[PDB]
């Protein structure tokens, strides 16, 4: 198609010249473009030069990229008849890419890597001075396994079944195949991870093309890289962890103190560099991204052992308990907090080097490690590494006392996001940035400063198949104003709005998905609604996303949606744009043909974080009180707009309330503003015009 | 030859005010007219009317070739209010129960007038779709306004995987057009199998009524058909003799056969400035200029219709008339 062909030419010229490009792709028709453009762009140079580094935000997009990559393999193998070196490595979740926890553990928690470290330590201990090896090991590093992938694609599911048949473990296959430089499909939380980005950065060996897919929550991921809430219980886990460290000190000092002195000599002689250069296949700890930290010559507590580290650690956690037991409102400057700490007790600005080393020493002296104590020690260790370094833009904040019991909390505020993304513009080039929910695309040259080119979407045809109306008059124009407050006002008006949702849902009974700015309105209309005929006549049942989302509940709600729409029933999907699961799988009538939006998206205000980042961005780009109520809400609404668009062969309609939507842009800017009662008949005609123009335009 | 099962939606959704005065009355009336036209262009065909009311499928007109039974059965529906909800699965299962005794050499058609946007079925309708496709049953759905995915999968699955039979109606005229489309047969590409039937009687007409006679009802008559096999004098219809099971056809089978054999050759439009012949029609007589929108640019041009199988001239009204009825072109009878 010519429209996507233009984006192919843009990707070509930006990959051949520019080092980074902001490309705006139309929603639903821009996923399969870059996947083939990158491969052909690799074949025109020479077959193995740059590799695809596709980055998504969810796992569903990773699976879609895997099956579409398989469509690329079949596409290139069915048109030429020649077999080439296949690519495609599926890097997914650790719990989903492991087989043993499904045989004995029967758990899908985040502690599967700890059990994997127990098995790996079992292998190392059966190869040194002596649990079993695991299920199958010692044959995952051979050439045959290194060639099972280039000869045949085994990614994720095919790798899970292939490992279940060939009696292998997929974790070491993927880990050993990161250096093979295949098409890696991982998420943003792995490229910028203060524990994963280092090893991945050391295995990919750079020199590739990075593809930022749906790059609209990049600031959200850079924010989520820090901010850890200290909620008084971590102080108890740190106290019990310090007691466990004292017991371990009594154990290593009781009988076996030679290994601690030998490793201590390894620290005095070769320091952290030798300690990390000698150990292989050993569990590591957290770090504030060593490539971004750039701090060498880590001295081990001014050349000291473990008793001094646990003494200064007890003093440090006691100082933390002292700083967390205060009045109520108090803000901290990370420099003033470090100076106050120095006034309480001298410890200098080197507890970072004192944590990254002592944690590894304790690991080298521990054989039975408790998970909660070690986890709390890793939390306090991260807090130390981030009060010792990284201060520009960092802002320690104490949560106020609001009952005062449920209160002693201390959160650290992260720094400028440009710093975190920075290394990719030295490691790499021609980083393609594609997103279908960006409008306007000027807040990415502004916020996050980087020199790039701007390419907007140039595809807009068959406007009769993309019904895009907006509702302004709700029959009284009183719910659009009351539906914009943080706390709802006049419950009777909200009940009238819900009645309007009952009338609208009754008018168009063909799959409805409703998005809310928060769960307060949902919990207010679901308690006592004075009506339920929509569930009793057209919808049979209603689908509600819990304010505390669950994986199995959401999965049963989505499968219930597909089966309900495949039985000719339909169901209303009351979800939150700010909640979990942003979806993205459409291209069928099983999804909501009509989508309802309750006003415009809103972010929770009256929070210390929004004021800290508010004044920070105010000092940075001077975009105060203007972009945090239109850019974020524009992205959250665009997440709902992207679900309506699903190819030109399909149709749909999305109703946006509130006049304030005119102040923001939108994908395909062709919108007509009228009432809701008129939109009922208008949609009643569109449900037939969309069915008439299909065979006429074909 | 054909066996159509008319399944009308008769639920609460039909009580709405779309058609005038409501959807139910217009669907019933247009269904009566569809019975008239269907039994006019298909004499030896079979019909069976089922309604979807109260969440159940109710057979209101048994499979028969007499139109009066269907007429009365349709008159009884308009005297009650359509209540309940439609059930596509029960209607398709009962339609299966009515189409199974039909021989394989006769087509099995199910015409569903679906006005509601939702159905109430007990079991999984996809299994019923598999059963319909397995036993070869063509299903055509005339839906109201918005589309239903189940109707798409049903009409597409029951027609060799081709989708062009789930017709959307937007007005009374459109519904009339679809009704008319169900009169005409559908010579599809098929799957290439064997076909033939044997034993078709031709009757002798008995005018005697002094003592009267009846072998199918034992009542008084004014004359009746004669079976050339069991030699019974029954009520007159060109359908099957109910005394030994064989047809009683006459010139009606020839009529519908020739109607299914009509090529309907559209005559080519040639301007008078290109044909160089005087304004003439061979079925009547036309000295009328067809084109005259402008001055001399259109008046002196006109339009003469041409049958190329005889090189003859005709006017438009006669092309339309010979396309409606009669064999095409009188000039093709003179050599
Ligand atoms: S070797 Fe594989 S199966 Fe065994 S614990 Fe490690 S990841 Fe799990
Ligand atoms: Zn007989
Ligand atoms: Zn004429
Ligand atoms: Zn002729």
From Swiss-Prot, chain A:
This chain belongs to which protein, by name? General transcription and DNA repair factor IIH helicase subunit XPD/RAD3
User: Which GO biological process categories is it annotated with?
Assistant: nucleotide-excision repair; positive regulation of mitotic recombination; regulation of mitotic recombination; transcription by RNA polymerase II; transcription initiation at RNA polymerase II promoter
Signal peptide range in chain numbering: none
Functional summary from the UniProt entry: ATP-dependent 5'-3' DNA helicase. Component of the general transcription and DNA repair factor IIH (TFIIH) core complex, which is involved in general and transcription-coupled nucleotide excision repair (NER) of damaged DNA and, when complexed to TFIIK, in RNA transcription by RNA polymerase II. In NER, TFIIH acts by opening DNA around the lesion to allow the excision of the damaged oligonucleotide and its replacement by a new DNA fragment. The ATP-dependent helicase activity of XPD/RAD3 is required for DNA opening. In transcription, TFIIH has an essential role in transcription initiation.
Activity versus pH: the note is: Optimum pH is 5.6 for both helicase and ATPase activites, suggesting they are coupled.
Q: Which family does it belong to?
A: Belongs to the helicase family. RAD3/XPD subfamily.
Cellular compartments annotated? Nucleus
Q: What is its EC number?
A: 5.6.2.3
Natural source organism: Saccharomyces cerevisiae (strain ATCC 204508 / S288c) (Baker's yeast)
UniProtKB/Swiss-Prot annotation, chain B:
Q: Name one GO cellular component term.
A: nucleotide-excision repair factor 3 complex
Q: Recall the GO molecular function terms of this protein's record.
A: ubiquitin protein ligase activity; zinc ion binding
Transmembrane ranges? none
Specify whether NAD is a keyword of the entry: no
Tell me the Gene Ontology biological-process terms attached to this UniProt entry: nucleotide-excision repair; regulation of transcription by RNA polymerase II; transcription by RNA polymerase II; transcription initiation at RNA polymerase II promoter
Intracellular or extracellular location(s): Nucleus
**Keyword DNA damage set for record:** yes
Q: Which residues form the VWFA domain?
A: 3-182
C4-type zinc finger positions in the chain?
A: 227-244
| Origin superkingdom | Eukaryota
Question: Which keywords does this Swiss-Prot/TrEMBL entry list?
Answer: DNA damage, DNA repair, Metal-binding, Nucleus, Transcription, Transcription regulation, Zinc, Zinc-finger
User: How does the annotation summarize its subunit structure?
Assistant: Component of the 7-subunit TFIIH core complex composed of XPB/SSL2, XPD/RAD3, SSL1, TFB1, TFB2, TFB4 and TFB5, which is active in NER. The core complex associates with the 3-subunit CTD-kinase module TFIIK composed of CCL1, KIN28 and TFB3 to form the 10-subunit holoenzyme (holo-TFIIH) active in transcription. An additionnal subunit, TFB6, plays a role in the dissociation of the SSL2 helicase from TFIIH after transcription initiation.
Q: What else is known?
A: Present with 2340 molecules/cell in log phase SD medium.
Per the entry, what this protein does is: Component of the general transcription and DNA repair factor IIH (TFIIH) core complex, which is involved in general and transcription-coupled nucleotide excision repair (NER) of damaged DNA and, when complexed to TFIIK, in RNA transcription by RNA polymerase II. In NER, TFIIH acts by opening DNA around the lesion to allow the excision of the damaged oligonucleotide and its replacement by a new DNA fragment. In transcription, TFIIH has an essential role in transcription initiation.
Q: Which family does it belong to?
A: Belongs to the GTF2H2 family.
- The protein's name in its UniProt record: General transcription and DNA repair factor IIH subunit SSL1
What organism does the UniProt record list as the source? Saccharomyces cerevisiae (strain ATCC 204508 / S288c) (Baker's yeast)
The part of the entire sequence present here spans 123 to 457 of 461
